[PDB]
Structures are given as structure tokens and as C-alpha cells.
Design a binder for this molecule. Structure first.
Ligand SMILES: [Cl-]
Ligand SMILES: [Cl-]
Ligand code: NA
Length: 129
């Protein structure tokens, strides 16, 4: 599923991401835009052989099982395929764990490089939230 901007903002808000660990909704929307372009089916193979899955490009090294990332963990206790669903519940539940891991949203390199310090509120401009 390719979400609309305000559509994804509303889903993230409903799932309690708005100001989760002090990160405003625009941070989460910006992160999803540059990780997946709002596409739930996005996948990216990393150099280390792990894969990034779903709207927030959650990685198989620590967070989900794809059965092909040797020495990996499954800390969100989900198949990585669950992160590709049109329903973002699993992606959000797992992102809440990731962002609690101690580095906040710096865990998303695309958030650090493209969202951090910017006018993230622009990402929810115009939305009926
Ligand atoms: Cl957009
Ligand atoms: Cl594990
Ligand atoms: Na894994």
C-alpha cells in the first residue's frame, strides 16, 4: 500500500506515535517519506546481508525474522513480512521498541540525514488530524 501523507499521519496518530519518546508526528511522517516513500511493501538489502522492511524500513539484524540474516535477533517477535502489510500496527509496535533503544530516531539514518533539525511540521501541514 502507498499511503497518502495525511492518511499515514492519521494512522501513526491513531497508533500513538504522535510525540512517542518526544518525537512529533511530522518526525515520523518525514522518516517514512525518506525510508519507504510511504510504500508498506518497500524492501532494501543491506551490505551486511540484512534487509529493511516496510514503511519505516525496519532491519532484520535485530528487529524481525526473515530466516536469511545469520546471527540476527527478532526483538519485535514478528516475521519481517508482517512489516509489509497495508495495516501498519506491526511496523508501529516495532518502531516504538526501536526508538526506545537509546539513540531515539537516530536509529533511522535517513531521519538523521534528512529530517533531524528540519521543519518536520511541514509533513503534517493541511492534514485534518
Ligand atoms: Cl508527500
Ligand atoms: Cl531475538
Ligand atoms: Na532477524
Amino acid at each position: 500500500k502507498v499511503f497518502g501523507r495525511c492518511e499515514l499521519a492519521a494512522a501513526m496518530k491513531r497508533h500513538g506515535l504522535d510525540n512517542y519518546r518526544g518525537y512529533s508526528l511530522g518526525n515520523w511522517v518525514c522518516a517514512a517519506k525518506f525510508e519507504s516513500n510511504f510504500n508498506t511493501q518497500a524492501t532494501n538489502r543491506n551490505t551486511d546481508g540484512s534487509t529493511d522492511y516496510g514503511i519505516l524500513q525496519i532491519n532484520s539484524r535485530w528487529w524481525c525474522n526473515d530466516g536469511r540474516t545469520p546471527g540476527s535477533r527478532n526483538l519485535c517477535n514478528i516475521p519481517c513480512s508482517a512489516l509489509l502489510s497495508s495495516d501498519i500496527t506491526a511496523s508501529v509496535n516495532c518502531a516504538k521498541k526501536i526508538v526506545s533503544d537509546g539513540n531515539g530516531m537516530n536509529a533511522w539514518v535517513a531521519w538523521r540525514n534528512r529530517c533531524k533539525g528540519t521543519d518536520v511540521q511541514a509533513w503534517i501541514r493541511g492534514c485534518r488530524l
